[PDB]
Design a protein around this nucleic acid. Structure first.
Ligand SMILES: [Mg+2]
Ligand SMILES: [Mg+2]
Ligand SMILES: [Mg+2]
Ligand SMILES: [Mg+2]
Ligand SMILES: [Mg+2]
Ligand SMILES: [Mg+2]
Ligand SMILES: [Mg+2]
Ligand SMILES: [Mg+2]
Ligand SMILES: [Mg+2]
Ligand SMILES: [Mg+2]
Ligand SMILES: [Mg+2]
Ligand SMILES: [Mg+2]
Ligand SMILES: [Mg+2]
Ligand SMILES: [Mg+2]
Ligand SMILES: [Mg+2]
Ligand SMILES: [Mg+2]
Ligand SMILES: [Mg+2]
Ligand SMILES: [Mg+2]
Ligand SMILES: [Mg+2]
Ligand SMILES: [Mg+2]
Ligand SMILES: [Mg+2]
Ligand SMILES: [Mg+2]
Ligand SMILES: [Mg+2]
Ligand SMILES: [Mg+2]
Ligand SMILES: [Mg+2]
Ligand SMILES: [Mg+2]
Ligand SMILES: [Mg+2]
Ligand SMILES: [Mg+2]
Ligand SMILES: [Mg+2]
Ligand SMILES: [Mg+2]
Ligand SMILES: [Mg+2]
Ligand SMILES: [Mg+2]
Ligand SMILES: [Mg+2]
Ligand SMILES: [Mg+2]
Ligand SMILES: [Mg+2]
Ligand SMILES: [Mg+2]
Ligand SMILES: [Mg+2]
Ligand SMILES: [Mg+2]
Ligand SMILES: [Mg+2]
Ligand SMILES: [Mg+2]
Ligand SMILES: [Mg+2]
Ligand SMILES: [Mg+2]
Ligand SMILES: [Mg+2]
Ligand SMILES: [Mg+2]
Lengths: 185, 61, 67, 144
RNA sequence: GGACUUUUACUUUGAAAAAAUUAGAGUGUUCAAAGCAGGCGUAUUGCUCGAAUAUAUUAGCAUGGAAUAAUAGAAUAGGACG
RNA sequence: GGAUAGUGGCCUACCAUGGUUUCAACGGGUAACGGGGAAUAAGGGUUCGAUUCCGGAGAGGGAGCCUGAGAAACGGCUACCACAUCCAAGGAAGGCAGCAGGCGCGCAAAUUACCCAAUCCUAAUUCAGGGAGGUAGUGACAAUAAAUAACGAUACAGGGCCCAUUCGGGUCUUGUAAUUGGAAUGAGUACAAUGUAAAUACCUUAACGAGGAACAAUUGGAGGGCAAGUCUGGUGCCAGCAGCCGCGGUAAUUCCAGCUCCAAUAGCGUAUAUUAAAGUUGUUGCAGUUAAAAAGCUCGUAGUUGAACUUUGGGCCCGGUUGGCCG
């Protein structure tokens, strides 16, 4: 009799499971952005469906409707803060033209490669989850982080792990310890 | 239909197929890395086309 | 690390208002041994069956089995 | 025209006339008459467990010719006897008389499947393991 | 100045309307599902934004409207106004 | 009038003969507690709601009643019925649809653990008590996040802004490997401290922990629908597959296998139910000459539906909403 913990699923599956043209395009998005499985594509196709739906519902309301203005702007104001919506695409008619790569572009996955730090999307992954990266003070190991506009500049190797200073790894430190004990004496 | 026809022959073919052990090969990657294997293979290097861009052609052609 | 903290004027007042589990963390109050819940509860049901003094019915017990 | 009452005040007759023609809908009739609880060999349940009476080679319908390797199972819960197929190759030897098999439908919504006449069910586990576990030799049939 | 629906149906606005849940605002739980948290500053004795909002009307209550659709009225005048 | 706390056919006396019903009474069925709500997502709808909140009901079945503000109470009593325990056979004693646990049932559902620290409740009451509650256990019910690898060197191909008479190779760069090279990390493991009522685990973090036969991803498929094989071997209308259409009788693209390949991926398959697909229930929105379907015909009560018309047109006043012009 404890209050129920609410939850929701984050993704959706396609209506026709076998489509060559759709299975290729999904593979492409997988390889460009270093994705894991179709589910990660799917999760984003979902976000887009929800945002285009709320927009559609706003655009059938008369302009200068308090609800259309209040929710219209806030939708646009969040889409800009992450770098999904351009410095001006800022009308609602434009979010409706937005697509998935616009979201996929903002992955801390894709930003670690976008500025240096990686030289791969796959190098970018293994880096992130392995604890060397930081956004401000904070280590973030989630490749889905979705880097927001004004935090873009704080992304650099973490205060720990060799790539930020403060000791080398324990692979390296083992290699220093074999050169010592063996031919050193 | 007649229900009492012969059960004598059950498992005939499976039993009499010559057993063949599967050959050891390298472990394929799992996860994001396998998917990377498909992308760079399926379309980057473009090593297979008749114009039909075959996925699994039979030996020779 | 983030946590909470308390400063009590007059330690005597901290001994009055602290939840006693923190007093034993600080050695400021003794850890009290007690029977386990199940054992305690069971003795309560056993002492339910008794009405009165105890030791008076133990004279009743003792008056029999001399036999 | 159109033959149906359009009056603003005709909702009762529209309401009931549909209630009446819903009874030509197969899956509405079934669900209302409780056919599942009554006439179904399962109780309307997803699976039913029962014990193997005898094994029956059922010859398949034309154009196909073969012997389909089924078993006859009497259900623990209704005691109703039903004849069920055994999938894959030679699994027949995995099921012996008196063996207490777990049964499941054929996925046709109770219609018979393919070239097997009258066989509306399929074996799943013998004596509590699996057929795929046995057929693939991941497990052994429990020694009785 | 305050009070007519002859009698309705219909339609507008509003009140009265539990939370959860649904939609949705705000908030970097490291992302997220969530949660309703939190955010500043000297961190020495402090300061401070929140915890919106939208939403069944079937029926009732309050209300603005009188098209549509019903309905009542003077004919053996036993009619209306004084 | 009696009764109730009180209204009242609640009950009684007398007196009337009424009350409900095709606008479906009454009865029968429900694998029926109602609602907040849930699934499905053009809309309209369809299906579900035992189950976290509210309300109801019950405590094996019925009825009775004691105490009390409050019970027709069941971890209160009395009795019958059905069960059912102990006995010295005289007798006594019981109601897990509370928490754990057992049996039974079945396709179907976890520990006879810890604690009042939190939430709140009770009492004469800060203290006592609380299987309310919370902690841990079990738990692929659902849900979120997302490791199973990352980056370079050599050797052929490669495409190759070239440099070309004749590898006359510019300087790159994609993939490839019985070839090497160092880097990284938590899955674990573990001092501690953190967490906690005490512990567990999470977060943090010393000492450890990644080179293949490991820290080895799986489940379904590869004739069509439908994404991927005319490859090899076996079988020979047999064994088997195949939701549907189909496949197998000696060259099987469909079975049994090896190889390869596709799909989804810590998840995938199967059965059943349900929704969309279904304008195949049709108000929106179906069909009825021959495809399923106009009653042989007319009358006709309920119901449904029902021509037109009665204040139009004109003239003034007051003040709002969005509009381009300037900062
Ligand atoms: Mg929400
Ligand atoms: Mg018609
Ligand atoms: Mg109509
Ligand atoms: Mg034949
Ligand atoms: Mg056929
Ligand atoms: Mg929000
Ligand atoms: Mg959030
Ligand atoms: Mg009304
Ligand atoms: Mg008219
Ligand atoms: Mg009276
Ligand atoms: Mg009364
Ligand atoms: Mg009376
Ligand atoms: Mg019932
Ligand atoms: Mg609803
Ligand atoms: Mg539709
Ligand atoms: Mg309910
Ligand atoms: Mg039930
Ligand atoms: Mg329950
Ligand atoms: Mg009760
Ligand atoms: Mg019971
Ligand atoms: Mg009780
Ligand atoms: Mg009772
Ligand atoms: Mg009890
Ligand atoms: Mg069992
Ligand atoms: Mg289960
Ligand atoms: Mg069990
Ligand atoms: Mg407490
Ligand atoms: Mg206490
Ligand atoms: Mg899970
Ligand atoms: Mg140690
Ligand atoms: Mg954990
Ligand atoms: Mg290591
Ligand atoms: Mg290794
Ligand atoms: Mg194909
Ligand atoms: Mg197969
Ligand atoms: Mg062959
Ligand atoms: Mg094959
Ligand atoms: Mg439909
Ligand atoms: Mg309509
Ligand atoms: Mg039709
Ligand atoms: Mg005909
Ligand atoms: Mg006809
Ligand atoms: Mg007639
Ligand atoms: Mg006739």
């Amino acid at each position: 009799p404890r209050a129920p913990r609410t939850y929701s699923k984050t993704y959706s599956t396609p209506k026709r499971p076998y489509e060559s043209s759709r299975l290729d395009a999904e593979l492409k998005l997988a390889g460009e952005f270093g994705l894991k499985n179709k589910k990660e594509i799917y999760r984003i196709s979902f976000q887009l469906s929800k945002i285009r739906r709320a927009a559609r519902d706003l655009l059938t309301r008369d302009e200068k409707d308090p609800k259309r203005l209040f929710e219209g702007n806030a939708l646009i104001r969040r889409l800009v803060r992450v770098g999904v919506l351009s410095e001006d695409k800022k009308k609602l008619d434009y979010v409706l033209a937005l697509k998935v790569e616009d979201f996929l572009e903002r992955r801390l996955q894709t930003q670690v490669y976008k500025l240096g730090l990686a030289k791969s999307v796959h190098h970018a992954r293994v880096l992130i989850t392995q604890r060397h990266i930081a956004v401000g003070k904070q280590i973030v190991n989630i490749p889905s982080f979705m880097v927001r506009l004004d935090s873009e500049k704080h992304i650099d190797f973490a205060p720990t792990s060799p790539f930020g200073g403060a000791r080398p790894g324990r692979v390296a430190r083992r290699n220093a310890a074999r050169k010592a004990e063996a031919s050193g004496e | 239909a007649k229900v009492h026809g012969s059960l004598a022959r059950a498992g005939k073919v499976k039993s009499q197929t010559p057993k063949v052990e599967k050959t050891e090969k390298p472990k394929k990657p799992k996860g994001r890395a396998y998917k990377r294997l498909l992308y760079t293979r399926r379309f980057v290097n473009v090593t297979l086309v008749n114009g039909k861009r075959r996925m699994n052609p039979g030996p020779s052609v | 690390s983030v946590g909470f903290g308390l400063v009590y004027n007059s330690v005597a007042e901290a001994k009055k208002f602290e939840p006693t589990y923190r007093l034993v963390r600080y050695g400021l109050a003794e850890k009290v041994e007690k029977a386990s819940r199940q054992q305690r509860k069971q003795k309560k049901n056993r002492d339910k069956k008794i009405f009165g003094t105890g030791k008076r019915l133990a004279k009743k017990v003792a008056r029999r089995n001399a036999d | 025209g159109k033959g149906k009452p359009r009056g603003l005040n005709s909702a009762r007759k529209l309401r009931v006339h549909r209630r009446n023609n819903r009874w030509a809908e197969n899956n509405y009739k079934k669900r209302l008459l409780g056919t599942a609880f009554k006439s179904s060999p399962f109780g309307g349940s997803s699976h039913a467990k029962g014990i193997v009476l005898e094994k029956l080679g059922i010859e398949s319908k034309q154009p196909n010719s073969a012997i389909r390797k089924c078993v006859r199972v009497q259900l623990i819960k209704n005691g109703k006897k039903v004849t069920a197929f055994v999938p894959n190759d030679g699994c027949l030897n995995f099921v012996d008389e008196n063996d207490e098999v777990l049964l499941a439908g054929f996925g046709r919504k109770g219609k018979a499947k393919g070239d097997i006449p009258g066989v509306r069910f399929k074996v799943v586990k013998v004596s509590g393991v699996s057929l795929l576990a046995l057929w693939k030799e991941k497990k052994e049939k429990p020694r009785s």
